[PDB]
DNA sequence: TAGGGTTAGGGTTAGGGTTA
């Protein structure tokens, strides 16, 4: 059985807020499919702000690719020497017309109530 | 100290018990078992016999006749087993009129739904319904129904990971139910907190002790008289509530005594077991329930009709009942009283009731 | 004349029927839906099945206090969960909830008389001509279903074109599923509890085309009015671990149905 | 009959003590444990009769039998601490751990010794174990408790009323010595007589006079089952009253006394016009019933001032138990407790698959079925109550369906035909059962066994042998645990010829008298045939007994049996004697050798408490190689074997005169006796010319010799 | 004299440790 698999928006997991190693799942836009090495960048806005991760895709050959289309990746995080963070994927799926701020504030709720449940103990 | 679990016998007064609940997978995991019953779990006071999670598949595992399922909900990870129910006996059709033709055609159709709706592949979502089970020193779902979710958008996983919290912090997080209120079994000694609450439970007392003896005739005061009756009535809360004299303090609490025993006894007369007769003796009542040549009398009027015609139909309703045994025999006549003598009467196999409140003879 | 209470004591008032009969009382002017009235010195009495109502006799005094609005509004009903009713404080009698249908227990489908309401068979009644002077047929149809909202459990009786909407058909499936069972007359499945249509509909009833998240705004079955407090509480022998025990349980809900809908 | 008296009779002891003869024992241990209800009856002397009368027993105290270690085993480490083991010790142990957690207060203790030969493992053969006093309100000790000195305790979860009848040694109903009489303040049952006793010791067994008479009703009625919801209803009452009817003798002339009828009408028809002016033109005590409640109240108040105690029907369990049940739920029926003799308002929960909630509600009342009765009596061609009829009063018996009810109510003289139906119908079966006298049997088979009589009605065999062992291993001082074929291919051919047919009697009792198989004389040391685990096709059948050891148990009864059939038919042989004494012998018989077969059975079913596979497996061993030899043994003197099975084997002849036939049968079973003496064979008859068709299938002329030396040819095919 | 019919109903169990 694998571990779990936590929420984190783009911008954090950008920046290398995480351990190495761990499971996360994120989402963003997909940004270019380079063919022969098997790299995919995909991108998500944060006001004038861009974010890049890059997502080996190794384990789900075939796959279709939508240009300019939203995305969710669930897998897990190795620190490259030179490329940097890299996510290994296990599931990657394609979501349409889902906006996200309801999905950013549906996140901070959780934490926030965990959090509260946190004080307990 | 040792936190003692709930009694296995009060469980299902909780209605959570028969319900499937929704958890964190988390929660599920961490959360821990009852010894005095193995087989349930038990959950901040509230034991759970069945829940339902969702989430996207990442395990897929088959063997000879159950299949196997690694769910994840975004905290934790647990295994599924779905049994392969047996479709054996495959049901061959005939060749009737058109209709059966076209109803084979839609059971086609719905069989071959039901196996597409069934299949399952990773990196779907699913649903599944169950109860928990511990096996090789790890924890199990059960699954009595499941089946594939189709959500294209996220909308039906935003909407229950939005909805959990809220069912938490208004249910679960919550410290137990209310069955069987708190203290309610006996009073805690008789002396109680409430003084009406106080003539209340005097008044079945009082009434046992004269079933006991099956009294007939009885005074007030022979009833004060009885030393277990004052007892019963001497309580602090009525010592308090018997400040109406100085100079007679133990006259005023005799009268206080008196006045709830009277209290007791018109509460017995409202419930027609004492009636009331004009013999010019203010404390003297008898129990209905002893009156044997009264209930003679109606089972007389009964068989008679309540002189109702032999030619319309048999049995009289309560009403007019009332009005024939008052003017019959006592104008002074409780209705409570009459409605106690037709239900003894009943007991002894004398009337039959063709429905309430109309009774007929054989 | 149906009337719904209002009092500061409650604030969930309970419903009730007034009845005025007319050997000696034209209707006065005014009654009419939607218009506050104050009544007062009625004479009360209890039904055959324990339901309290008000006749109106000559000792009454009718005042009416407001004419009804020029136009009829509506308020959605409460949203609650299905647990607050086992709570004595201040629980409604109509509401809506979120839920979810477990397992059936009994599917009747008729085809009665237009007139003795007797079951007919080909559009002709079993006692036609000695008590019916006219050939039609009217379908009924009863159903009784076992929901969950998530903390708690009761059982919903639906009725008329409700079962047809609680079975997710289209109008033309369900005319024609009618049309097929108009032959034989009747069809009555005791599924629970104590020919291709009898497999056709076991198989229906135990999948997932109709085991689905449904939005449920149900009426309380024991009316408002009717009082009848005799329940303690029973005894079975539930098990899980091959390991019987017993434990106290309530007794079981019992809820009507007034509209289903998909989600 | 004033209610403040108890009419006690008084005794050689110059007290006024209490004899009843007890019929039924009733208890309820989730909502009163340690209650005994008993039910019987006592002899009015002013009535000059015999009225129901009711005795409860209260204080009752729990019996355990803790096993105790021979070493100390730590119950945290699972290791010997290296100490012996004492009572002392065992005690102290007990009262520091097991009262202390499980709240005992009230505790009585004693070393004591029994017999341990079940097929429990890890108990020593013999042991001085200890008794454990206590009363039932604290909670009940786990069932698999097991301590530092004790590794388990016996009798964790007996039903009370099986102590408190064994320990006065009581078999079945018979007349009671009740001491101490205590009045009751408030009645709790319909019976006349109601009393109160405080201790169990109060009772001693007395079986110096015959059972007073009893009550037996037999009734029936007409089911409608409904169009709209298949809800069926009743619709007619009809039964048949006897008053005093004899438990000692034939079915005495007349049967009945009295009989009543009730009906009532559907809720969209009506009855026909001048129904009552009919009824008086006819003048037949029959009763109208204006509604379904109605109709109710009066059957269950006839019943009620009737108080039967035997009631008989057809298929009463199967549906007649549960419909009337639903019908009172359904109705609201005030009272529905009348039916059977306690005052309850909690009724047990319907629709049960096994059905222990329909025999729970009829406490109280002996209630038999025609059905299991013809059943366990004889063969019959089908169960259907007209084939019976066929088959005993050979009178045709008319269904009904629905479409003749429907219009059925068109006139009145048509309901009074469908009545006298109902009524003949109930004649009818009251004849069947008095005929087969049905009631005296069970009541022997109940002495013989001593087990409790209302289970006997439904054939519960395995039950009586259960209690039986019970008896018989209490009385040798023994601890009991808890509670939850082959066919032959002889030589193929078919013969036209005469065929004398042989079968044998008892072969398994007459294998476990011959080898003494017994649990206490039975080891189980081998590598036979059956108790080994999944290692390969071998396992373990115990080998035979040595008959040297000392003679087992369960022999010593069933040749007790045997010796008491032995005495029976030599007292038969002598004349002038009762025809009643005669018939009481033939049934006394005929109850032995029905406790003879289910003296196998009672190993043979897997559902058996004291259930020992390995003695089952070397009873079909036995039986296999008594077969073998019998047939190999009958082959060597050239008669052919045509088929056999298991006991019942048939000799091809190839003759037509009878008298060879007899002599080659009797020659044949004085080969057979040879080796085994107790086992014998008997003419179970002769074919005179039989053919074969298939499996089960024979077509044959039955051979039945008159006294002439001739025989008649009748012809049987199956 | 005011509700319809009033009926309590599903309440088990199923086995890992495997390749061309």
Redesign the interface.
């Known amino acids: 059985?694998?571990?779990?698999?936590?929420?984190y928006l783009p911008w954090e997991v950008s920046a290398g807020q995480v351990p190495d190693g761990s499971t996360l799942?994120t989402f963003g836009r997909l940004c270019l499919y380079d063919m022969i090495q098997s790299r995919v960048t995909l991108m998500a806005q944060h006001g004038s702000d861009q974010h890049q991760v890059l997502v080996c895709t190794k384990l789900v050959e075939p796959f279709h690719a939508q240009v300019g289309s939203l995305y969710?990746v669930?897998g897990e995080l190795q620190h490259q020497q030179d490329r940097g963070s890299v996510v290994k994927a296990?599931?990657?799926?394609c979501?349409?017309?889902?906006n996200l701020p309801?999905?950013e504030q549906?996140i901070r709720?959780?934490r926030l109530?965990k959090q509260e449940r946190g004080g307990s103990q | 100290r040792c936190e003692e679990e709930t009694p296995s016998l009060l469980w299902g007064l909780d209605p959570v018990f028969l319900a499937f609940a929704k958890l964190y997978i988390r929660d599920i995991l961490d959360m821990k078992e009852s010894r005095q019953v193995p087989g349930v779990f038990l959950y901040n006071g509230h034991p759970i016999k069945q829940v339902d999670v969702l989430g996207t598949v990442i395990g897929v595992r088959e063997r000879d006749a159950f299949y196997s399922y690694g769910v994840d909900d975004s905290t934790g990870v647990i295994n599924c087993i779905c049994w392969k129910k047996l479709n054996t006996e495959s049901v061959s059709a005939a060749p009737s009129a058109a209709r059966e033709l076209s109803l084979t055609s839609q059971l086609k159709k719905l069989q071959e739904t039901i196996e597409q709706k069934t299949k399952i592949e990773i990196g779907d979502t699913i649903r599944v319904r169950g109860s928990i089970r511990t096996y090789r020193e790890e924890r199990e779902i059960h699954a009595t129904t499941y089946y594939k979710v189709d959500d294209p958008v996220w909308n039906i996983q935003i909407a229950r990971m939005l909805e959990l919290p809220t069912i938490y912090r208004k249910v679960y997080d919550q410290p137990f139910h209310s069955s069987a209120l708190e203290k309610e079994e006996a009073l805690s000694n008789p002396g109680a907190l409430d003084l009406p609450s106080l003539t209340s439970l005097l008044s079945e007392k009082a009434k046992e002790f004269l079933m006991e003896n099956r009294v007939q005739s009885f005074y007030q005061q022979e009833l004060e008289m009885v030393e277990s009756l004052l007892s019963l009535a001497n309580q602090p809360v009525i010592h308090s509530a018997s400040s109406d004299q100085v100079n007679f303090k133990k006259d005023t609490t005799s009268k206080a005594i008196h006045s709830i025993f009277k209290n007791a006894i018109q509460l017995l007369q409202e419930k027609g077991l004492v009636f009331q007769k004009d013999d010019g003796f203010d404390n003297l009542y008898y129990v209905t329930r002893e009156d044997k040549d009264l209930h003679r009398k109606i089972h007389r009027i009964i068989q008679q009709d309540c002189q109702k015609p032999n030619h319309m139909e048999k049995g009289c309703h309560f009403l007019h009942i009332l009005a024939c045994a008052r003017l019959s025999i006592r104008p002074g006549l409780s209705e409570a009283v009459l409605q106690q003598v037709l239900e003894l009467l009943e007991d002894q196999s004398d009337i039959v009731s063709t429905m309430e409140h109309y009774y007929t003879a054989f | 004349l149906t009337v719904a209470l209002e009092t500061a004591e409650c604030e969930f008032p309970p419903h009730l029927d007034v009845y005025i009969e007319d050997p000696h009382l034209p209707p006065s002017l005014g009654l009419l839906p939607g218009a506050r009235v104050h009544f007062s010195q009625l004479e009360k009495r209890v039904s055959r099945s324990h339901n309290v109502y008000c006749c109106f006799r000559s000792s009454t005094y009718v005042q009416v206090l407001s004419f009804p609005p020029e136009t009829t509004i509506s308020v959605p009903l409460p949203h609650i969960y299905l647990a607050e009713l086992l709570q004595g404080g201040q629980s409604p009698f109509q509401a809506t909830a979120s839920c979810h249908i477990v397992s059936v227990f009994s599917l009747q489908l008729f085809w009665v008389c237009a007139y003795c309401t007797s079951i007919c068979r080909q559009g002709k009644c079993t006692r036609l001509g000695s008590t019916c002077p006219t050939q039609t047929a009217i379908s009924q149809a009863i159903i009784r279903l076992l929901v969950e909202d998530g903390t708690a459990e009761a059982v919903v009786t639906c009725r008329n074109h409700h079962v047809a909407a609680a079975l997710g058909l289209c109008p033309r499936e369900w005319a024609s599923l009618l049309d097929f069972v108009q032959v034989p007359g009747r069809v009555v499945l005791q599924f629970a509890g104590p020919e291709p249509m009898t497999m056709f509909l076991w198989t229906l009833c135990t999948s997932p085309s109709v085991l689905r998240p449904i939005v449920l705004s149900f009426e309380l079955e024991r009316k408002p009015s009717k009082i009848v407090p005799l329940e303690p509480p029973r005894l079975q022998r539930f098990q899980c671990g091959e390991l019987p025990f017993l434990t106290h349980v309530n007794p079981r809900l019992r809820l009507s149905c007034l509209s289903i809908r998909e989600s | 009959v004033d209610s403040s008296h108890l009419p006690l009779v008084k005794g050689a002891d110059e007290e006024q003590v209490f004899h009843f003869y007890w019929l039924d024992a009733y208890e309820d241990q989730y909502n009163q444990p340690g209650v005994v209800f008993l039910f019987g009856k006592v002899w009015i002397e002013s009535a000059e009769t015999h009225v129901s009368c009711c005795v409860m027993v209260k204080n009752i105290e729990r019996t355990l039998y803790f096993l105790p270690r021979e070493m100390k085993i730590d119950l945290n480490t699972g290791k010997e601490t290296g100490t012996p083991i004492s009572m002392k010790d065992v005690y102290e142990e007990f009262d520091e751990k097991i009262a202390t957690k499980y709240k005992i207060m009230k505790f009585k203790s004693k070393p004591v010794e029994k017999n341990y030969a079940f097929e429990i493992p890890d108990v020593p053969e013999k042991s001085e174990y200890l008794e454990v006093k206590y009363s039932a309100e604290m909670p009940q000790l786990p069932q698999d408790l097991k301590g530092e000195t004790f590794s388990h305790v016996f009798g964790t979860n007996t039903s009370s009323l099986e102590l408190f009848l064994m320990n006065r040694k009581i078999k079945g109903p018979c007349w009671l010595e009740v001491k101490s009489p205590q009045l009751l303040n408030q009645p709790v049952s319909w019976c006349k007589v109601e009393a109160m006793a405080l201790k169990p010791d109060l009772v001693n067994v007395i079986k110096d006079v015959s059972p007073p008479p009893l009550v037996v009703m037999a009734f029936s009625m007409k089911t409608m089952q409904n169009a709209k919801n298949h809800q069926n209803e009743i619709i007619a009452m009809a039964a048949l009253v006897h008053h005093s009817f004899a438990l000692d003798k034939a079915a005495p002339k007349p049967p009945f006394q009295s009989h009543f009828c009730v009906v009532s009408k559907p809720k969209d028809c009506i009855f026909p016009y001048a129904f009552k002016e009919v009824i008086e033109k006819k003048n037949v005590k029959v009763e109208v019933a204006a509604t379904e409640r109605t109709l109710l109240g009066f059957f269950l108040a006839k019943v009620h001032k009737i108080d039967p105690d035997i009631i008989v029907g057809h298929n009463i369990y199967g549906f007649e138990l549960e419909v009337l049940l639903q019908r009172i739920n359904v109705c609201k029926a005030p009272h529905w407790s009348k039916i059977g003799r306690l005052k309850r308002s909690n009724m047990p929960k319907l629709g049960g698959r096994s059905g222990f909630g329909e025999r729970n509600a009829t406490c109280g009342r002996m209630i038999c079925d025609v059905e299991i009765s013809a059943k366990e009596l004889i063969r019959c061609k089908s169960y259907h109550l007209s084939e019976l009829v066929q088959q005993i009063l050979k009178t045709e018996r008319v269904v009904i369906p629905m479409e003749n009810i429907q219009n059925m109510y068109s006139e009145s003289s048509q309901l009074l035909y469908l009545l006298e139906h109902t009524w003949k119908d109930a004649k009818f079966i009251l004849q069947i059962m008095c005929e087969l006298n049905v009631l005296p049997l069970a009541l022997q088979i109940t002495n013989i066994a001593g087990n409790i009589m209302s289970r006997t009605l439904m054939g519960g065999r395995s039950e009586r042998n259960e209690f039986l062992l019970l008896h018989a291993f209490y009385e040798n001082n023994y601890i009991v645990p808890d509670k939850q074929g082959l066919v032959l291919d002889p030589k193929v051919g078919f013969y036209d010829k005469f065929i004398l047919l042989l079968d044998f009697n008892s072969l398994y009792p007459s294998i476990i008298q011959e080898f003494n198989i017994c649990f206490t004389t039975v080891q189980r040391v081998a590598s036979e045939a059956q108790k080994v685990t999944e290692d390969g096709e071998q396992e373990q059948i115990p080998e035979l007994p040595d008959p040297s050891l000392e003679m087992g148990i369960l022999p010593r009864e069933i040749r007790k049996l045997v010796e008491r059939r032995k005495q029976v038919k030599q007292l038969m042989k002598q004349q002038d004697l009762n025809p009643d004494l005669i018939l009481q012998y033939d049934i006394r018989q005929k109850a032995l050798k029905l406790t003879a077969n289910s003296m196998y059975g009672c190993l043979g079913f897997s559902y058996s408490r004291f259930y020992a596979k390995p003695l089952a497996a070397l009873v079909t061993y036995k039986g296999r190689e008594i077969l073998m030899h019998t047939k190999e043994m009958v082959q060597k003197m050239n008669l052919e074997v045509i088929y056999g099975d298991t006991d019942s084997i048939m000799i091809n002849t190839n003759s037509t005169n009878l008298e060879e036939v007899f002599k080659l049968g009797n020659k044949v079973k004085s080969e057979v006796n040879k080796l085994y003496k107790l086992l014998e064979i008997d003419i179970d008859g002769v074919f005179k010319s039989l053919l074969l068709l298939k499996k089960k299938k024979y077509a044959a002329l039955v051979v039945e010799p008159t006294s002439d030396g001739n025989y008649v040819t009748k012809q049987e095919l199956k």
Not at chain 1, 1 to 7: D, Q, S
């Open positions: 059985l694998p571990k779990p698999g936590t929420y799942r969710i669930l296990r599931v990657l799926t979501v349409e017309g889902m309801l999905l549906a709720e959780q109530y």
